[PDB]
Design a protein around this ligand. Structure first.
Ligand SMILES: [Ca+2]
Length: 184
């Protein structure tokens, strides 16, 4: 009943230590929220986009650590808004494994510093809302130490953002989220 996608920031601003955290967070979530009726998908982004595993591919090999271990950082710019648009349109595409009727959950992991992207959030959020894609934002790096980046997470996250935005090293975020998913 749940299709869960991850949009992970692979741009250059993302320090290697932090990209690893992103992969460790994603792997743990998959292992924790592993429900017989829950599929996972992941796309990495910078200026270019990469679907590491579709819902179908996960359904064919539900081994989190196996799917996440080969993932290498793309580097480059940060086209977050475009990435969100591609996720809803490409990941939650039934030709990719997405199931009609299932709840749509997107976990966006970034440092909150969109750059180079020709699209603004205001261009991709309405469509996400329209597709009923619930958004969780996990902030890595200095995402919370800047006024700009802090608001970027709030802008991406569903309402209320305070209930949808977590720090990557708040190891208690997965249980809060999981607790929340019982209230879809
Ligand atoms: Ca970046």
């Amino acid at each position: 009943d749940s299709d869960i996608a991850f949009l992970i920031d692979g741009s250059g601003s993302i320090i290697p230590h932090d990209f690893r955290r992103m992969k460790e967070f994603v792997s743990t979530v998959m292992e924790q929220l592993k429900k017989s009726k829950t599929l996972f998908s992941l796309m990495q982004y910078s200026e270019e986009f990469r679907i590491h595993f579709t819902f179908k591919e996960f359904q064919n090999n539900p081994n989190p650590r196996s799917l996440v271990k080969p993932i290498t950082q793309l580097l480059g710019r940060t086209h977050t808004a475009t990435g969100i648009r591609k996720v809803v349109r490409e990941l939650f595409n039934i030709t990719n494994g997405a199931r009609k009727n299932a709840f749509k959950i997107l976990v966006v992991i970034t440092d909150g510093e969109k750059f180079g992207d020709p699209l603004g959030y205001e261009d991709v959020i309405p469509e996400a809302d329209r597709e009923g894609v619930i958004r969780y934002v996990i902030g890595v790096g200095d995402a919370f130490r800047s006024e700009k980046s802090r608001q970027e997470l709030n802008t991406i996250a569903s309402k209320p953002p305070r209930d949808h935005v977590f720090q990557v090293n708040n190891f208690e975020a997965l249980k809060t989220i999981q607790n929340q998913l019982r209230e879809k």
